[PDB]
Amino acid sequence: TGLAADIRWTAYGVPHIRAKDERGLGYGIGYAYARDNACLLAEEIVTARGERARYFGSEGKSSAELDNLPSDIFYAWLNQPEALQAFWQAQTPAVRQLLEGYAAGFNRFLREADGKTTSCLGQPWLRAIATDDLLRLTRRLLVEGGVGQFADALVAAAPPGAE
Amino acid sequence: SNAIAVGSERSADGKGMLLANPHFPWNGAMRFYQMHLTIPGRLDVMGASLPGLPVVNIGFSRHLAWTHTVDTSSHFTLYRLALDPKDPRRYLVDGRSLPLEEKSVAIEVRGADGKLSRVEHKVYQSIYGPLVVWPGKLDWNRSEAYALRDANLENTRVLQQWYSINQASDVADLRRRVEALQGIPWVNTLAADEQGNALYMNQSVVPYLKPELIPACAIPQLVAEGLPALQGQDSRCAWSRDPAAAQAGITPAAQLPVLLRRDFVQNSNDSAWLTNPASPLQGFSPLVSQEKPIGPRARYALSRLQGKQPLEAKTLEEMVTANHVFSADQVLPDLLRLCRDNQGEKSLARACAALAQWDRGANLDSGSGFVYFQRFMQRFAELDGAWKEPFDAQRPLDTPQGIALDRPQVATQVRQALADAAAEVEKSGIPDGARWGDLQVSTRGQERIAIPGGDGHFGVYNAIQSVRKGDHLEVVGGTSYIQLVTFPEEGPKARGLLAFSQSSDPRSPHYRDQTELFSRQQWQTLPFSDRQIDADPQLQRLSIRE
Numbered sequence: 001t002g003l004a005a006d007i008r009w010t011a012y013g014v015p016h017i018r019a020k021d022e023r024g025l026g027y028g029i030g031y032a033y034a035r036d037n038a039c040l041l042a043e044e045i046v047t048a049r050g051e052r053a054r055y056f057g058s059e060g061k062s063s064a065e066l067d068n069l070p071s072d073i074f075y076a077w078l079n080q081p082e083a084l085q086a087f088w089q090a091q092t093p094a095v096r097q098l099l100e101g102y103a104a105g106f107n108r109f110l111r112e113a114d115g116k117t118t119s120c121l122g123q124p125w126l127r128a129i130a131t132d133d134l135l136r137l138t139r140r141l142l143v144e145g146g147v148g149q150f151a152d153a154l155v156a157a158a159p160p161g162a163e
Numbered sequence: 164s165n166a167i168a169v170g171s172e173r174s175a176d177g178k179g180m181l182l183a184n185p186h187f188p189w190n191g192a193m194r195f196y197q198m199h200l201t202i203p204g205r206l207d208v209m210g211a212s213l214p215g216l217p218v219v220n221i222g223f224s225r226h227l228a229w230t231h232t233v234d235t236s237s238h239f240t241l242y243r244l245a246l247d248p249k250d251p252r253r254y255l256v257d258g259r260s261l262p263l264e265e266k267s268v269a270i271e272v273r274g275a276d277g278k279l280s281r282v283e284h285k286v287y288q289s290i291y292g293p294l295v296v297w298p299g300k301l302d303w304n305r306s307e308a309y310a311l312r313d314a315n316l317e318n319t320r321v322l323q324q325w326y327s328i329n330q331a332s333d334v335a336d337l338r339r340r341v342e343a344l345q346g347i348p349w350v351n352t353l354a355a356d357e358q359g360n361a362l363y364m365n366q367s368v369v370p371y372l373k374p375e376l377i378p379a380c381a382i383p384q385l386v387a388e389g390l391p392a393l394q395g396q397d398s399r400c401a402w403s404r405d406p407a408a409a410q411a412g413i414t415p416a417a418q419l420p421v422l423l424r425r426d427f428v429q430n431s432n433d434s435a436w437l438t439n440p441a442s443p444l445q446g447f448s449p450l451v452s453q454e455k456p457i458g459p460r461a462r463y464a465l466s467r468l469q470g471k472q473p474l475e476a477k478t479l480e481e482m483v484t485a486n487h488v489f490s491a492d493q494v495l496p497d498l499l500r501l502c503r504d505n506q507g508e509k510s511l512a513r514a515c516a517a518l519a520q521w522d523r524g525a526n527l528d529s530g531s532g533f534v535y536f537q538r539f540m541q542r543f544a545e546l547d548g549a550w551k552e553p554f555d556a557q558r559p560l561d562t563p564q565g566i567a568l569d570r571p572q573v574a575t576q577v578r579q580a581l582a583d584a585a586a587e588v589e590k591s592g593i594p595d596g597a598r599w600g601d602l603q604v605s606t607r608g609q610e611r612i613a614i615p616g617g618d619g620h621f622g623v624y625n626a627i628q629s630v631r632k633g634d635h636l637e638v639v640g641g642t643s644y645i646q647l648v649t650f651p652e653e654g655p656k657a658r659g660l661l662a663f664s665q666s667s668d669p670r671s672p673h674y675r676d677q678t679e680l681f682s683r684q685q686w687q688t689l690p691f692s693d694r695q696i697d698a699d700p701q702l703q704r705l706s707i708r709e
């Protein structure tokens with residue numbers, strides 16, 4: 001609560017979010033983004049949570065074209081609870097509020113959605129999101145120029161046998 | 164990605180101007196999304212961002228516009244480990260045997276039977292970070308392994324960094340806010356403001372090693388392949404500490420390239436070096452910026468930007484919409500000469516006809532010459548010493564150029580390359596007088612939309628990357644969010660498009676509306692002022708709370 005946003009959309013579905021604080025601003029962002037891209041975010045959160053194989057089995061790939069299971073291993077390693085928690089505790093109040101609003105706004109759209117702009121309505125993986133999920137997305141983007149480019153290489157790193 | 168910032172000394176109105184032309188995926192977790200964010204009195208910023216981020220990543224405000232390009236700086240280092248001779252799960256630092264740490268993760272897997280099973284996986288970690296295996300390159304054998312230290316894992320400042328950029332007033336404020344926090348992971352920043360400053364910063368999170376340590380700490384054979392690899396058996400090859408760095412182990416801001424000018428700055432994913440050739444950026448760490456031959460997108464932009472003529476908004480727009488295949492400038496004239504020299508050679512006839520009739524563009528109506536040209540260039544790239552003028556460090560804007568047709572062996576190889584390229588094009592299902600736009604498309608439901616542009620490796624500023632899917636090339640990345648910003652007295656004038664549209668959902672009214680416009684290269688107003696927003700006949704408004 002204490003979450004309020006004013007949203008204007010201009011041509012082509014461009015949102016203009018006005019609010020009195022970061023929390024309301026987040027709220028508007030997440031609501032507007034969910035209207036256009038709920039399924040994308042849900043899919044990418046699944047990826048970033050390392051839950052691809054759980055929903056889709058080992059035969060599929062993420063949108064970065066990694067096999068589900070190696071992808072899951074990488075993201076489960078990347079986004080361990082302590083990494084998330086340390087990351088959260090380092091955030092400024094303003095950023096925390098931005099993220100809280102966003103999660104809340106995304107979930108509000110999910111509560112109300114009737115399929116008008118959401119093709120994955122009903123899927124078990126389209127779920128309410130939490131701030132940790134946005135931290136998971138953030139960290140996935142953070143390492144895109146580093147260990148992210150070696151996700152497969154990390155999963156493959158196993159010690160030698162008797163050779 | 165491309166970025167050009169124009170300052171008071173070159174713009175047609177004596178003020179700042181910015182072209183933002185990032186090249187990013189059309190799907191997934193890096194799909195740009197447009198938004199305007201306002202907390203009245205203290206925040207008013209518009210642009211585009213990555214999924215899940217409640218900040219603007221590339222945008223503009225009242226007196227400022229900025230954008231980003233993937234940099235050539237290193238954001239991690241590999242560490243070659245020397246293994247304990249008695250135990251390949253132990254590694255030596257200063258000759259002391261340290262054990263690897265093991266972290267297990269457990270993953271649920273949906274089986275064929277629809278039921279879940281638990282997969283346990285061990286992740287081996289050293290003091291540097293996790294081990295990585297690239298078979299035939301970075302192995303884990305009985306004498307060596309490689310670990311990876313990612314500098315951005317400890318960058319908790321990334322979100323605060325963009326929020327801060329979103330609040331910046333002008334170029335000097337932006338520079339301050341970016342240098343103070345050092346939260347940018349892996350991009351350059353280019354910016355212009357109303358007063359006419361043009362800024363380039365190679366200001367990101369980059370592993371720090373003092374300059375006297377580099378030659379001794381590098382793995383020579385791996386750095387020559389462009390991998391940031393260090394000796395992990397030596398404690399002195401740990402990233403250096405400098406109390407002025409915002410994060411331990413990273414390069415201080417004072418040591419990263421910055422260029423402040425009133426004429427122009429540009430970047431097309433090459434290093435800082437020739438950001439503006441009138442003022443070269445040099446003497447940086449090899450982890451930071453090296454003096455390497457620029458790609459053709461940069462060469463193209465410099466050929467348009469150098470000189471004394473004023474630059475208009477339209478000038479910069481047309482650098483994108485021209486769809487000019489700049490790599491043609493280097494090879495096509497000699498290639499066409501070789502075609503004339505081999506008239507009546509049956510294998511070359513169709514290729515040479517197509518190439519000589521080609522507009523040298525990646526426009527919708529561009530002839531099949533572009534297709535012949537691409538396949539030839541792919542083979543050309545594999546030839547040894549075929550350039551008439553090879554890269555020259557003293558003429559970096561103008562080399563390489565031309566085909567060494569005077570060397571008889573090269574002439575034989577280039578012709579065989581052209582025959583082979585012709586054959587591949589003729590094998591494929593390309594019709595008769597089919598155009599580039601008939602081939603390159605973006606699928607939208609059961610329909611297809613022709614997409615102009617082409618691969619940036621061929622010097623097309625409007626970079627579009629496609630993959631073969633059935634009978635077409637399906638666009639997967641490239642030109643995405645476009646903004647072109649100027650600063651007339653009333654307020655920022657911003658123009659552009661989101662190439663793939665706001666929504667990735669087929670059910671959306673905004674799934675393909677800007678894609679139709681991108682096809683026709685019809686850029687639009689990006690409304691920023693209340694007035695601009697109110698002038699929009701499609702205006703919708705909703706207020707929400709809980």
Ligand SMILES: *C(=O)CCCCCCCCCCCCC
Nearest residue numbers: 138141142164185186220232233
């Ligand atoms: C061309 O190189 C495209 C550059 C696009 C970069 C988008 C802005 C940078 C976003 C990184 C934010 C990291 C979030 C954790």
